[PDB]
């Protein structure tokens, strides 16, 4: 499930949701591309 | 025969605005390639453009 895999990634592979400080262009790209294409 | 149509380098006429248009397309491609490297557009968007 998507609870053990996340825990496995943290413990075994050292994952952490580190903050990504994005430029306005990068912030727009992630927010707009979730809606569609044009 | 009497008119004697021919063909020289000078006769191969390009329209006056080609240099302006090619330079504009080059500029837009250059800016998009930079922002592709920054992660602002994805590879398919660069391909289409």
TrEMBL record, chain B:
<comment type="function">
    <text>DNA-dependent RNA polymerase catalyzes the transcription of DNA into RNA using the four ribonucleoside triphosphates as substrates.</text>
</comment>
<comment type="subunit">
    <text>In plastids the minimal PEP RNA polymerase catalytic core is composed of four subunits: alpha, beta, beta', and beta''. When a (nuclear-encoded) sigma factor is associated with the core the holoenzyme is formed, which can initiate transcription.</text>
</comment>
<comment type="similarity">
    <text>Belongs to the RNA polymerase beta' chain family. RpoC2 subfamily.</text>
</comment>
<protein>
    <recommendedName>
        <fullName>DNA-directed RNA polymerase subunit beta''</fullName>
    </recommendedName>
</protein>
């Amino acid at each position: 499930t998507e609870d053990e895999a996340r825990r496995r990634n943290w413990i075994e592979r050292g994952w952490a949701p580190w903050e990504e400080i994005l430029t306005p262009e990068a912030d727009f790209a992630r927010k707009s591309l979730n809606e569609g294409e044009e | 025969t009497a008119t004697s149509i021919s063909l020289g380098i000078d006769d191969l006429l390009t329209i006056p605005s080609k240099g302006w248009l090619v330079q504009d397309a080059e500029q837009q491609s250059l800016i998009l390639e930079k922002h592709h490297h920054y992660g602002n557009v994805h590879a398919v968007e660069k391909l289409r453009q």
